[PDB]
Amino acid sequence: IHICLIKNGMDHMYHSFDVPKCFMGNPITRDINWVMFREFINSLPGTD
């Protein structure tokens, strides 16, 4: 994924990647919504 982003000119965005605010419980407090992580990964549309 990193090298694909390097080719696509998105190095800065990759190094700016962080835990999404929707996943992260609150910006101030380090809390993780693990349930929604499982929901997202179970809903990940893999190619064949």
> Burial letters for 19-39: b for 16+ Cβ neighbours within 10 Å, e otherwise?
eeeeeeeeeeeeeeeeeeeee
User: 48 a known binding residue?
Assistant: no
| List of residues 6+ apart from 33 with CB closer than 8 A | 22, 23, 24, 25
- Three-state SS sequence of the chain: CHHHHHHCCCHHHHHCCCCCCCCECCCCCCCECHHHHHHHHHCCCCCC
Q: Which two tokens stand for residue 5?
A: 């982003």
The CA distance from 36 to 33, in Å, is 6
Structural contact between residues 31 and 25, judged by C-beta atoms closer than 8 angstroms: yes
The CA distance from 43 to 29, in Å, is 27
Phi/psi at 33 (5° precision) = -85, 85
Method used experimentally: cryo-EM
User: 12 a known binding residue?
Assistant: no
The resolution in angstroms reads: 3.3
